[model samples]
Target: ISPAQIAEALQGRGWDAEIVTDASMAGQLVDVRPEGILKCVDGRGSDNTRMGGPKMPGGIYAIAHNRGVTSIEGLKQITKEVASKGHLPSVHGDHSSDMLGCGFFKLWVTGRFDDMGYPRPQFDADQGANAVKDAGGIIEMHHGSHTEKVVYINLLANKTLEPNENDQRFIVDGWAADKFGLDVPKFLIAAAATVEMLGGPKNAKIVVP
Candidate 1:
């Protein structure tokens, strides 16, 4: 399928859609048999000393199940969908002392040097950390000794808070948007498409693309 076809399918389902080029920094697109599962670790653990591990950056991580896409176009569609909705928090709120508000999607394309071994990008750790901090949140990572690498491509969002809300409500909503409760339907659809394309749940592998 072409990017246009994919956008058509998504729009038919009542989703806002767009096709992105210049995604070289995000990673090369690959084919996974339908029904494959991909696990994305938030990459932000409690300690920053470790390499290629999970950390606690106050953002949510997702495990996507691929449906049955076997072409670059299919992958592109999946990515577009994910990118579109992932940015809801920053585009819709005012939590960053008004500096960062509202969650909108962004695509990060990385180089080979950034690909470690996870489905997420190596640069995602830093990007994610910065995103959280910019939104007035804290992050923690695991500590260790290993060569640090970064990724070329990534998808992220910026969240904005309401100006009139009380401090407590603003804080609570920030966590909600960051951790959960955005447009879950979009996410599930992306995961389902990935799983179907991968062939089945048993063949899922998490690779740093």
Candidate 2:
């Protein structure tokens, strides 16, 4: 799809998205396939559902399952395997911070490399997940309860762009706006609260752009 078509698809999913003519992203095509999936499986609940954008060439996938205990080491191994497949590595699966980790998503929003610079076992076994993002992997968070279809669409919109440290903040800002009926001041407060919920620093800068 053209950039406009991709943006329109994103808009259809309730995201405030537009094509940035000078976006840092290069020539990658952001194709939004209807019902596109990572891979098809023959099981009761298949991995057929595409939760994020198509895995870009040379990208790795850090897959995390629900209620699964994913340690830093486990993610590291996944990165190794994803690399073996010749693709850029990315984070996938549910958004349960404890089950997997929230470091990548947090890093994307706060633009804080320090958040993922060191290990935080007390918070979320995030060191490994952070490595994936450090390597330019997409951080796609999905869960039946935490993220609705609309929210997933928002994530996909961000995924379509070249990885940007400050991009994911849009999701938090969008949610806050919806919660506050788009009242600027109210949504600003809402944004702060949402970041806090993500375990971001209490004084983290909240950018609405």
Candidate 3:
């Protein structure tokens, strides 16, 4: 959605908002832009261009699983790894530099799975569980306010055995419902959290006392 759209939603939610033409004053306002704009590829890479491009409309949906690390420090480590792969950058304008892409990081309270779908943890099961529970559940990313852009963390639908036992198990598409055994209640919780993070329903109006 547009920045103006985001502002209206926040205002409706009773959040104090001020629109600014300059970036310096808009710090609280999430800068709605594309990943490429926020981060440049390799200095000489073709993806390195202006902040916004025809293909870069300032928004794209991203999905990530935190694999249960839960703590802010754990989240930081994961973001750093992802950024190193050159997808998102590790720098911001100010306020936070090391926490670049902080707006796009989503931490899964559930244990994380690698690309292969195998759970990766540095500790044993009980230790991992305690760590995750203490990590404040999840860390979501958003553009600005809770209305603009947001990301959600959820369990994968199903599991796929590795071709070889040594390989990491991966989530099998079309099996999330079957594998997770997620009914309406579980699904609703996840859905509501995501919507709320994205500013909830925008058309609804409120009467203030």
Candidate 4:
């Protein structure tokens, strides 16, 4: 399936999306699919459906599901992949990080990121899924429920993106303004919390546009 095909499906359902084709990226999608999803799923008892966005576009996704690289450069690589590899994949059952990963990948490459980390935390390990730590604590990964070696939690309330080096922040805010009854300050706080829980956007840097 072609990327444009996916974009078309999203449009048919009232999504304000378009196929991305620029020197900056490709096969990339930009839309509030989740919001549209609620309106268009048009079916019942489908939360278990787990059906996703079209392949040409993307699939069932959650902004929170992208357990990403702790480094800026790593995300940059994904953006490059978008540009070089044409349209690829988004969120799915087996690979749920597509929307989360690819969404950020586009912004990162186009210079929307700041205080960049080439490999912020670079925290990934089948064995270390529960812990992340760099030498001298320059960067470390946080997990839910902790008892020294490991801890884990489901709520986002515990996360705090207190950047030790980058102090990085984002302005694409107001993600849940209506749904969460949030203001600018509230949105910023939530965004910070996500950054922290998602692996701390450590070693962050901006782009050249």
Candidate 3 residues lying further than 4 Å off, grouped into runs, are: 1-65, 89-192, 197-199, 202-209
lDDT winner, 3 or 4: 3
lDDT (tens digit, per residue) of candidate 4 on 1-209 = 23344335334533333332222322222322321211110111112221221111111111211322445344334333322322222221112332223222323333333343222233232211122111100111111221111111101111111111122232221222223232333323323333333343321111111
Every candidate's lDDT: 0.26, 0.33, 0.26, 0.24
- Candidate 2 on 7-78: residue-level lDDT in tens? 454445344544333233335325443233221010112122343333221122213221121455555555
TM-score of each: 0.22, 0.27, 0.24, 0.21
- What's model 2's lDDT at 160? 35
Best by lDDT: 2
Q: What TM-score does prediction 2 earn?
A: 0.27
Q: In model 2, what are the clashing residue pairs, if there are any?
A: 58-87, 58-88, 59-87, 59-88, 59-89, 60-87, 60-88, 60-89, 60-90
Poorest 10 consecutive residues of model 3 by lDDT?
54-63
Which residue runs of candidate 4 sit more than 4 Å off their true CA positions? 1-26, 33-180, 203-209
Model 3 clash tally, residue pairs: 6
Q: What TM value does model 3 have?
A: 0.24
Q: What is the C-alpha RMSD of each candidate to the true structure, in Å?
A: 19.2, 15.5, 17.3, 20.0
- Backbone collisions counted per model: 90, 9, 6, 28
Per-residue lDDT value at 45 in model 3: 18
